[PDB]
Design a protein around this ligand. Structure first.
Ligand SMILES: *[C@@H]1O[C@H](CO)[C@@H](O)[C@H](O)[C@H]1NC(C)=O
Ligand SMILES: *[C@@H]1O[C@H](CO)[C@@H](O)[C@H](O)[C@H]1NC(C)=O
Ligand SMILES: *[C@@H]1O[C@H](CO)[C@@H](O)[C@H](O)[C@H]1NC(C)=O
Lengths: 37, 49
């Protein structure tokens, strides 16, 4: 419908993948980083 | 005795934008083999370039 703005990019719980999202100016900006912890 | 300042500005200033467009193939949209009808006019965006 509307995606003309398409984008393409025991182990001790060894991961931490955080996708914490905040909005500025109303228009959405993804903020993320994958820390292997 | 203080006389004045001097607001120098050699060779004014330089205007700079990033390197040339990326994912703007205007030719295949404008020199296209496939066009549209007038009542069926196509609609495609160009963005981030
Ligand atoms: C795209 O967004 C507009 C804005 O409301 C909406 O009217 C339209 O239905 C959307 N596209 C499609 C194919 O539904
Ligand atoms: C992972 O993130 C990078 C960020 O530069 C992206 O290029 C890539 O497509 C993403 N996905 C994979 C599977 O690498
Ligand atoms: C939606 O967002 C706009 C500006 O971002 C705000 O003015 C409006 O009150 C919001 N509406 C709701 C229902 O949250």
């Amino acid at each position: 419908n509307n995606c003309t703005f398409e984008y393409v990019s025991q182990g001790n719980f060894k991961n931490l993948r955080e996708f914490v999202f905040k909005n500025i100016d109303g228009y959405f900006k993804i903020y993320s980083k994958h820390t292997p912890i | 005795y203080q006389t004045s300042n001097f607001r120098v500005q050699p060779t004014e200033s330089i205007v700079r934008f990033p390197n040339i467009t990326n994912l703007c193939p205007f030719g295949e949209v404008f020199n296209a083999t496939r066009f549209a009808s007038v009542y069926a006019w196509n609609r495609k965006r160009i963005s981030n370039c």
